[PDB]
């Protein structure tokens, strides 16, 4: 497993933030950009809680970005037993993030969109869930 790309993202966050530390503290230009970076990472879900730039130096990690992966997200939500099963469901097109079907396992769910990841309406997997509960309603076609 290669985390080359995420290391570059983590590194680029470190190099960028360091340059802000160099720029004089009272400058409004740096303060605005530092907050935008923190807001962006918070929106992405990398930072679970609003953090300071000094915290952003060390909280950002490859594992944090891996946690936002859709198959990893599904595993915690218990939609899939194991990551490999989650990837297979994504490839076969049984999962939707909001109104959009995502067939790319590499997709990272944002913080707001985390709540709306679910099975597609006509998935045979979804029918298996409702049949197990005996709650399958054919008016909803699922």
């Amino acid at each position: 497993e290669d985390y080359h790309k995420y290391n570059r993202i983590c590194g680029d966050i470190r190099r960028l933030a360091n340059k802000l530390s160099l720029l004089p503290p009272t400058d409004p230009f740096r303060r605005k950009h530092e907050q935008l970076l923190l807001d962006k990472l918070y929106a992405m879900g990398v930072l679970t809680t609003k953090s300071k730039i000094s915290d952003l130096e060390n909280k950002v990690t490859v594992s944090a970005i891996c946690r936002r992966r859709l198959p990893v997200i599904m595993h915690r939500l218990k939609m899939a037993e194991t990551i490999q099963d989650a990837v297979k469901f994504i490839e076969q097109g049984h999962v939707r993030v909001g109104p959009n079907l995502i067939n790319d396992p590499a997709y990272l769910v944002t913080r707001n969109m985390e709540d709306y990841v679910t099975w597609v309406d006509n998935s045979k997997i979804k029918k298996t869930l409702l049949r197990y509960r005996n709650q399958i309603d054919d008016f909803d076609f699922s």
Partner: protein, 792 residues
């Protein structure tokens, strides 16, 4: 009950390939992705060809006669089209990547640069009937050892210069007998040869290299042979020559470098006429007019197109398209202009008639999600993911106000009160609809109640109620104006993606995730109709798919919908390759349009994202003129119009009604009968003939006696005709007669005549006022000069 046909593509003026000037010099041909766009510079108009290639266009050329246009894609597949009739003539496959194509100045022959081979073919005759196999190869030349960069025709159709990557410029003779005349290879350049040209006398040959060296070749004694008499160099610090063109008559050399700047030189003296820069991106193409007074330049990276008049240093054309897909579009209330927004965050205002960008706004930091006009039309609003809503004054083109939430909420949808005093926006993260005051800019309040993100908003243009829908599977009608506030929620079977409000304001349609368009009555809050859309939607299997298209459910719904201004049809689009037009009262599909046929686009047919461009429609709207609808897509703003009207759609026709009888009615001076009969046939040419043959004295008599059924038709005819016609006073006489004669009837039925009156007001405001406004200022300017005391 109208037939819409693709007319033109806004938002894109140049994508790649070579731009070509028309032989008359009054029209410019620019390849726009998978199609060809033609710009009428003198008349300031444009149109896009309806024919479509499988892949992006690579090389095009138009013959000097102006009758035949050849276009070649990146796969070598060619399409020959009749320029005058705008109809495809033939398809031929050259089975190889053709770098360039050029017609002979005679027009009998055209030459192809295919790899390292020069192929010469015979031009099919346009006059002759359609031929199964019209393309015949005159000859194939194989001299070069590497790909041919470009080719140039001799003025007499007797020689061709081909420049290749072999650092050599080589000449050939079109006539086999004339092989001994020109069978020479020119060498000496230290880099790729980009262009070889004849002089006007054809005695001299100029060759230009990528390194920036121009070699002048003459036939002279050392017994006689071609020699480099003079050498010129472009001393660009690092820029490499990208495109070269030469005009023999004026001896103008226009060169575009990779640094994004172009130089004009006078040969053989190498006098630098001028040097300008369009930007930091390479200048991919350069072209010259037939007379040599207009220079056209094209940069592919940012889609810039520039037509430059070096005589007067004026810009005939200066345009740049959207770098990103157009996320939203909005028509001006009268339909004169359309505003487009892109994922960049830049808003561009377009003129429908000219098809050119009047202004570009770059204040928004992030993508602009929605754009909407006020009912008055002077003001335009836009919302962006950066967390701001901005109001734009289009008479003065300024952002006179900006609205924002307390905590920087990302906005996806927007709606404006008809009075232009309240603005509402929705978000995918807050679940509340923020309301602002236009005059003050303060947060009036947040409308709460949705348990899901608010997907879409709309105010009723008349009743001023607000309708919102969400992924909460519900629709809420807000009566915000008034002493007391009411909310009426309506449940829906699935998530609501798009919402449209009927122009009369009595019904609302919603497109759901199930692929259903459901219509509800707002006053009663009960469903009145439903339309199935899953089966109509055409979705292609993506190249990365591991499941079939029929089993695929990626997008079998419509993410955008809009009513027709008559109220009887809905146009719908989504993340798919189909634009479906339905009829609300009877719930049937009137027609389906294929958005794109480009094979490159994905939908037409663990750290790395597998992503390629896809075909999708972001927004659709009907033109308020009721003759066209525009659909924003990845390639650009597609506009379909019913202007051509080649169909025969008679109304209440009878055996007695005939075009000959209508002319006889005019000859007998039965003007009212002739006009009525012309409308029953519904032929524009016959209506126009009768319309212009009615004397001024008889207009009030005819106008008062027109049957009420034909009144909406005639008013619509006048408004559309008067916008581009020259008979300004004749039309105004007709409008005055109709309004005075049928003014009460129009008022009694405002909705019936809403589109006809709007077109009339566009003519009276956008052309008629400008004439009197200039006429009156001369009158006052005149009086001051004569009445006032002259200067010392």
């Amino acid at each position: 009950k109208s037939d819409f046909k693709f007319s033109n593509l806004l938002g894109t003026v140049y994508r790649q390939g070579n731009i070509t000037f028309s032989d008359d010099g009054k029209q410019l041909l620019s390849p726009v992705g998978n199609r060809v766009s033609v710009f009428d510079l003198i008349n300031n108009k444009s149109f896009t060809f309806e024919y479509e290639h499988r892949k992006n266009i690579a090389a095009i050329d138009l013959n000097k006669q102006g009758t035949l246009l050849i276009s070649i894609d990146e796969d070598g597949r060619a399409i020959l089209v009749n320029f005058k009739a705008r109809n495809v003539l033939h398809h031929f496959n050259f089975k190889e990547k053709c770098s360039a194509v050029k017609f002979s100045p005679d027009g009998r022959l055209f030459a192809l640069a295919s790899g390292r081979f020069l192929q010469i073919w015979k031009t099919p005759d346009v006059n002759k009937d359609r031929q199964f196999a019209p393309f015949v190869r005159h000859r194939v030349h194989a001299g070069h050892f590497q790909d041919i960069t470009s080719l140039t025709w001799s003025q007499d159709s007797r020689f061709i210069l081909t420049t290749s990557k072999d650092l050599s410029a080589k000449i050939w003779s079109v006539d086999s007998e004339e092989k001994n005349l020109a069978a020479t290879t020119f060498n000496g350049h230290r880099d790729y040869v980009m262009g070889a040209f004849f002089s006007h006398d054809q005695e001299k040959i100029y060759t230009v290299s990528k390194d920036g060296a121009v070699f002048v070749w003459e036939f002279t004694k050392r017994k006689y042979s071609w020699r480099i008499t003079k050498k010129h160099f472009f001393y660009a610090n690092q820029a490499k020559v990208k495109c070269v063109t030469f005009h023999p008559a004026t001896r103008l050399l226009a060169v575009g470098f990779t640094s994004g700047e172009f130089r004009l030189y006078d040969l053989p003296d190498f006098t630098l006429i001028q040097q300008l820069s369009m930007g930091q991106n390479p200048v991919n193409t350069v072209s010259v007019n037939q007379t040599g007074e207009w220079l056209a330049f094209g940069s592919s990276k940012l889609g810039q197109l520039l037509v430059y008049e070096w005589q007067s240093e004026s810009y005939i054309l200066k345009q740049q398209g959207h770098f990103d897909s157009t996320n939203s579009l909005a028509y001006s209330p009268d339909g004169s202009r359309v505003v487009t927004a892109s994922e960049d965050g830049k808003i561009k205002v377009w003129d429908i008639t000219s098809g050119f960008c009047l202004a570009t706004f770059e204040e928004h930091t992030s993508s602009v999600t929605a754009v909407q006009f006020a009912k008055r039309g002077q003001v335009m609003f836009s919302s962006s993911l950066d967390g701001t809503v901005r109001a734009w004054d289009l008479i003065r083109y300024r952002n006179f106000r900006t609205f924002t939430g307390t905590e920087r909420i990302q906005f996806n949808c927007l709606a404006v009160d008809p009075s232009g005093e309240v603005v509402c926006a929705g978000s995918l993260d807050n679940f509340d609809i923020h309301v602002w005051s236009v005059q003050t800019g303060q947060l009036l309040d947040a409308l709460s109640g949705h348990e899901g993100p608010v997907s879409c908003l709309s105010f009723s243009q008349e009743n001023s109620v607000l309708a919102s829908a969400s992924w909460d599977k519900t629709i809420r009608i807000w009566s915000i104006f008034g002493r007391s506030q009411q909310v009426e929620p309506i449940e829906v079977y699935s998530d609501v993606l798009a919402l449209s409000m009927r122009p009369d304001g009595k019904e609302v349609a919603v497109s759901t995730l199930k692929g259903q368009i459901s219509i509800f009555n707002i006053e009663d809050a009960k469903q009145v109709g439903n339309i199935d859309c899953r089966k109509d939607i055409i979705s292609g299997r993506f190249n990365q798919d591991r499941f079939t298209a029929k089993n695929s459910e990626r997008s079998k719904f419509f993410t955008t919908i809009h009513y027709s201004f008559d109220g009887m049809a809905i146009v719908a689009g989504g993340n798919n390759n189909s634009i479906c037009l339905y009829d609300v009262p009877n719930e049937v599909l009137l027609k389906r349009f294929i958005v794109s046929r480009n094979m490159a686009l994905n939908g037409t047919l663990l750290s790395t994202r597998k992503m390629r461009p896809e075909v999708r429609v972001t927004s659709v709207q009907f033109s308020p003129t009721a003759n066209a609808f525009a659909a924003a897509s990845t390639e650009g703003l597609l506009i379909y119009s019913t202007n051509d009207t080649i169909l025969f759609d008679p109304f209440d026709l009878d055996v007695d009604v005939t075009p000959h009888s209508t002319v006889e009615a005019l000859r007998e001076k039965q003007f009212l009968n002739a006009l009525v009969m012309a409308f029953r046939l519904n032929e524009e040419y016959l209506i126009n003939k009768v319309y212009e043959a009615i004397p001024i004295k008889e207009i009030p008599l005819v106008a008062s006696n027109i049957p009420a059924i034909y009144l909406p038709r005639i008013l619509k005819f006048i408004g559309d005709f008067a916008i581009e016609s020259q008979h300004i006073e004749f039309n105004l006489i007709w409008i005055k007669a109709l309004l005075s004669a049928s003014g009460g009837y129009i008022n009694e039925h405002k909705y019936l005549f809403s589109t006809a009156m709007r077109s009339i007001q566009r003519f009276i405001v956008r052309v008629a006022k400008e004439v009197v406004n200039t006429t009156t200022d001369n009158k006052y300017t005149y009086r001051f000069l004569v009445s006032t005391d002259g200067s010392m």
